[PDB]
Amino acid sequence: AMHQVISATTNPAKIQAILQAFEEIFGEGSCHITPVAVESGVPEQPFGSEETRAGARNRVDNARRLHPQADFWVAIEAGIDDDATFSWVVIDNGVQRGEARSATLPLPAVILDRVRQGEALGPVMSQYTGIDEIGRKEGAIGVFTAGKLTRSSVYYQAVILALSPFHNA
């Protein structure tokens, strides 16, 4: 038997975080991840924590509508707030929901000035660093931490944390 985990994203950094976290909690080889492209119903990279979480919740709901027979539906939505980037993780098993926010990454003013004329962080960071599609790789996190952390390793903790309701009490 396997836990069917629908990942509401095709971004490889996010899929890695989800797979590794689910395997750590439920065991190696226990989970099958199906990546799906679904809409959040709002623009990519919401401004504000609550709005970002709303995007993630919307993605989970839409993933459930698309793949109703699975065991878990998971989204990781990146947003901006208090001059930082972060993500919300939302996990639903059809009955219970677990949610956690990732650690924040303070952004430099020169990058914030751009995200505040509406630009997505990824493209801005790709121009700043010269690394194409930086958000599918190690991310702004990778760059500013000199590779000591990555998008994936930070999202990993957040997924583990959001999994708490599904294995305690």
Question: How far is the C-alpha of 126 from the C-alpha of 84, rounded, in Å?
Answer: 17
Is 69 annotated in some ligand binding site?
yes
Is 150 annotated in some ligand binding site?
no
Determination technique for this PDB entry?
X-ray
Per DSSP bridges, beta strands 97-101 and 84-92 are antiparallel
Is 10 annotated in some ligand binding site?
yes
Pick from 48, 64, 62: which is nearest to 5 by CA? 64
The residue with tokens 């799906």 is: 36
Question: How far is the C-alpha of 98 from the C-alpha of 61, rounded, in Å?
Answer: 14
Pick from 14, 8, 68: which is nearest to 41 by CA? 8
HSE of 97 in the Cβ direction (CA atoms, 13 Å)? 13
Question: How far is the C-alpha of 135 from the C-alpha of 156, rounded, in Å?
Answer: 15
Is 58 annotated in some ligand binding site?
no
Is 9 annotated in some ligand binding site?
yes
Q: What is the resolution of this structure in A?
A: 1.7
In contact, 43 and 76? CB cutoff 8 Å:
no
**162 is written with which tokens?**
């959001």
Is 13 annotated in some ligand binding site?
yes
Is 11 annotated in some ligand binding site?
yes
Which domains, and CATH codes, for the chain? Answer: 1-169 (3.90.950.10)
In contact, 77 and 55? CB cutoff 8 Å:
yes
The answer for 147, left when phi > 0, alpha when psi is -120 to 50, beta otherwise, is: left
Produce one character per residue of 9-48: b if its CB has 16 or more CB atoms within 10 Å, e if not. bebebbbbbbbbbbeeebeeeebebebbebebeeeebbee
Question: How far is the C-alpha of 94 from the C-alpha of 135, rounded, in Å?
Answer: 30
Q: Which residues contact 35 (CB under 8 A, 6 or more apart)?
A: 7, 9, 10, 15
